[PDB]
Amino acid sequence: XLXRXXX
Amino acid sequence: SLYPIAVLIDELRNEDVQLRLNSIKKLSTIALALGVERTRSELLPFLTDTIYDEDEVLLALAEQLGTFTTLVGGPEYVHCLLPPLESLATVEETVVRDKAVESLRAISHEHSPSDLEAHFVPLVKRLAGGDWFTSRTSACGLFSVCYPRVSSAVKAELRQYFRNLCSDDTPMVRRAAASKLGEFAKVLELDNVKSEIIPMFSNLASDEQDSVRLLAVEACVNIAQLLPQEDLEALVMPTLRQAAEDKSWRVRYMVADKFTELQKAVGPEITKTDLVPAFQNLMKDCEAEVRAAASHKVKEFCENLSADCRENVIMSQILPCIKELVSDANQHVKSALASVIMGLSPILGKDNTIEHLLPLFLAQLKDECPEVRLNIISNLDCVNEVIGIRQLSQSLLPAIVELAEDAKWRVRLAIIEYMPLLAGQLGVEFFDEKLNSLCMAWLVDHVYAIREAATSNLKKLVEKFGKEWAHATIIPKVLAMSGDPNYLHRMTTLFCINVLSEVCGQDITTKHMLPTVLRMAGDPVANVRFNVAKSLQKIGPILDNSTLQSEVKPILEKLTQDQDVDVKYFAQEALTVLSLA
Amino acid sequence: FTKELDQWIEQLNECKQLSESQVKSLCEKAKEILTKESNVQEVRCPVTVCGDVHGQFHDLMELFRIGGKSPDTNYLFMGDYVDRGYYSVETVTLLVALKVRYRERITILRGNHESRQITQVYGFYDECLRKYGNANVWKYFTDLFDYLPLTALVDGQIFCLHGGLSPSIDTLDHIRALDRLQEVPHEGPMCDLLWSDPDDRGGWGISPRGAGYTFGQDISETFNHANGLTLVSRAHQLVMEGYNWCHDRNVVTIFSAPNYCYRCGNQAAIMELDDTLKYSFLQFDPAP
Ligand SMILES: [Mn+2]
Numbered sequence A: 001x002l003x004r005x006x007x
Numbered sequence B: 001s002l003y004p005i006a007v008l009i010d011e012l013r014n015e016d017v018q019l020r021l022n023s024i025k026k027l028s029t030i031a032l033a034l035g036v037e038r039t040r041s042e043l044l045p046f047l048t049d050t051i052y053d054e055d056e057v058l059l060a061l062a063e064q065l066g067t068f069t070t071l072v073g074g075p076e077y078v079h080c081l082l083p084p085l086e087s088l089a090t091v092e093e094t095v096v097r098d099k100a101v102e103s104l105r106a107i108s109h110e111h112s113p114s115d116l117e118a119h120f121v122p123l124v125k126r127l128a129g130g131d132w133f134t135s136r137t138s139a140c141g142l143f144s145v146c147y148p149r150v151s152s153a154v155k156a157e158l159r160q161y162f163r164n165l166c167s168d169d170t171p172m173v174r175r176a177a178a179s180k181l182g183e184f185a186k187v188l189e190l191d192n193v194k195s196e197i198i199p200m201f202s203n204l205a206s207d208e209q210d211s212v213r214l215l216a217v218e219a220c221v222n223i224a225q226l227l228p229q230e231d232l233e234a235l236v237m238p239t240l241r242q243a244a245e246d247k248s249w250r251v252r253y254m255v256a257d258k259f260t261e262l263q264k265a266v267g268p269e270i271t272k273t274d275l276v277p278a279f280q281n282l283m284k285d286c287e288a289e290v291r292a293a294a295s296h297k298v299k300e301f302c303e304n305l306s307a308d309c310r311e312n313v314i315m316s317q318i319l320p321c322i323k324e325l326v327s328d329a330n331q332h333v334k335s336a337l338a339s340v341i342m343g344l345s346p347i348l349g350k351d352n353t354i355e356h357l358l359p360l361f362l363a364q365l366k367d368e369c370p371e372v373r374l375n376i377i378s379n380l381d382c383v384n385e386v387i388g389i390r391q392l393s394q395s396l397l398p399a400i401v402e403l404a405e406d407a408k409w410r411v412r413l414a415i416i417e418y419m420p421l422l423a424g425q426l427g428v429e430f431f432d433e434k435l436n437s438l439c440m441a442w443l444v445d446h447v448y449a450i451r452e453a454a455t456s457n458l459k460k461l462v463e464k465f466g467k468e469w470a471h472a473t474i475i476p477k478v479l480a481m482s483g484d485p486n487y488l489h490r491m492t493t494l495f496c497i498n499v500l501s502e503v504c505g506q507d508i509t510t511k512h513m514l515p516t517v518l519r520m521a522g523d524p525v526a527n528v529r530f531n532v533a534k535s536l537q538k539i540g541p542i543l544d545n546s547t548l549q550s551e552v553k554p555i556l557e558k559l560t561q562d563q564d565v566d567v568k569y570f571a572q573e574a575l576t577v578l579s580l581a
Numbered sequence C: 001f002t003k004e005l006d007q008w009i010e011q012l013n014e015c016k017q018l019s020e021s022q023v024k025s026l027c028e029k030a031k032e033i034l035t036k037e038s039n040v041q042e043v044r045c046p047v048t049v050c051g052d053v054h055g056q057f058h059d060l061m062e063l064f065r066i067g068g069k070s071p072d073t074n075y076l077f078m079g080d081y082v083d084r085g086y087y088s089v090e091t092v093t094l095l096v097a098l099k100v101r102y103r104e105r106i107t108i109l110r111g112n113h114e115s116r117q118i119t120q121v122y123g124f125y126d127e128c129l130r131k132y133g134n135a136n137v138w139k140y141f142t143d144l145f146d147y148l149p150l151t152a153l154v155d156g157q158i159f160c161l162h163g164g165l166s167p168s169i170d171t172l173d174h175i176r177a178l179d180r181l182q183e184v185p186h187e188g189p190m191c192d193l194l195w196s197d198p199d200d201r202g203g204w205g206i207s208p209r210g211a212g213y214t215f216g217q218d219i220s221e222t223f224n225h226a227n228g229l230t231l232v233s234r235a236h237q238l239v240m241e242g243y244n245w246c247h248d249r250n251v252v253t254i255f256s257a258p259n260y261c262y263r264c265g266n267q268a269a270i271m272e273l274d275d276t277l278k279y280s281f282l283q284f285d286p287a288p
């Protein structure tokens, strides 16, 4: 979930 | 200056009449250059004054003056030594003041009774009644020595001054008096211990300053031994019971600290009556420092219980408290108890131990703080010699194995450490039967770190059972791994040979390990090929030179021709280090 | 020189960066060594295959604790050495260092993060500015990344690459036919290998990342059969369990950065391929 480029 | 003495002086620096230190040690020699006559008239005087804080010098001077009774004329002249010592006693650096006292105490016995009264006691008063404090602080250490030899009328004087020292306006002089109350007590005749000591003791025990109270606990041990058991209850116990309840945890800390000493000094009856309850209260103190100090005393206290009805107070008055402490919050506390708890086995019996102690032993053995469980693990002996090796193996071994195979490799790593302990503590015969397997298993664990752990752990087992046990119980199973298809395991073998060369000695290495090493030089996997070079370079210095020419040098030269880069490099390196190049 | 590398390595193992001077050098030779290797690097087992590391230096040290130390243990990293973690510089430099010291003990592949564009958005760029004082070390490493092999083949049976399969590549020759010496493109075969993701919808799909594609089981089966592969080994995707099987075991995901970005709470894993291509996984939490 950190940004879809990837948690 | 002048020359017989100017030798003591150091005319080369820039100080203030400072002395050559190495020379103040060659002091009892200048004492000969001039005779007794001139030692007294010129040497001592020169020493008395002329005191430039060189400390290291002042110290050697205080020590030296203690062994000068003869260089001055013998007993009839010891007092010639007082003046300079009195001086040093009232210095700054305590270390020196101490030495001064030790010496004054020493030569005290040289003074004739007549000279004590005539010269010694007077110095004691002047230090006691001194203005500055260090003077007073150091006076306290000089009462016990002169007290016995002087006259009835003078003793009294000595008691008065000592009294005045305990009630001194300063805490330090008071702590000092307190710390010497015991020895002074020990040399007065009963009646006076009852009439003068007790009151001083009572007073200091109820001191405004807890740094002073804290100290009356030790004085208590002494006064309590000097008195007949009947008088204890009236003259001491109330004061002692108060100390255990004292507002200051420091004071209570001291009671727990010197609990075993009080126990003996007070007798078994009072111990069952008064001390057992106090012990319970200390183990329940809100301050962890106190509980832990108290726990630390558990075994020693239980041993000293009247054989009479010992075993019953333990099960009824102590064991409960213990059960509580095993669950304590402070690991400082759990820690103290664990480092002595199983020592209760012999006192409680092989049956009581098994039904009551063994469970606690387990709790702590599976505690969080690996320190606490290590304390249990380092003290299995007495539990072992009490109950049987099997009755214990049956209560411990499940706990161990339980972890030797666990989730976290870190946890398993913890158990590998207990190995050389468990080993050398439960005996080789037990190790070959119930432990060896686990130790062999870890050699082939999935986690590298664990393998590495158990590898170097073999060395610590040989250091515990010897090169013979090794060649018969370990080298065999270890050498086997060289046939293993996994290279991670094949390398493990060489890693075990590398460490075992360190403690198996030139013979067992050359005959049983060197062969397997040399043989793997033709291993299909390059990582093994080069680690073999490295193993030769490791166990090389353990082999005699005939060996290093016959089969080592050849093998390495072969490897240097290997197709693999790293194998080449390590072979060359191996050679260049062994000198076989 | 060898004595020097050993030094640099010992240093880097204490998590101490090397100088700009030494990076420039370390990089110039690493280029030499890496040019000779191919888009489909041949790797002989035994070897341990690891996934993403992303500057999590201290977890990398935990990884060596678990699989053995280089050069004793052979290693194959499938890229993604930088960004996210707090120590991309120490990490990447150590690995490149190991590769220059031990060409045959380690193989390092290229991941989607071994690129100039994404390193300027996800860490590695700024960290370099912070640790050195200009963009030089970044330039050296990003240039070096261009020589990083796109794929590795272990014993002609196990195919390893950072991301995944490409609808514009069905043959290992196709891959050997690409020019890898260039920044990773936004699309195409080279891009797809480093950006695609296995999936549970059949055939090809739209990549939710904006690069490469998703591919279902049927696709892998075909790619494997056509190339004589026993299984496809990739990374690039956080997998809570550290490692993950899919496509009826034609594909396996291996993520080597535990508790990724120090926020997701995933395990990390590492795959051991022994002397016989027999595979075993080692899962591990973050080092304390
Ligand atoms: Mn990726």
Ligand SMILES: [Mn+2]
Binding pocket: A006, C052, C054, C080, C236, C237
């Ligand atoms: Mn990634």
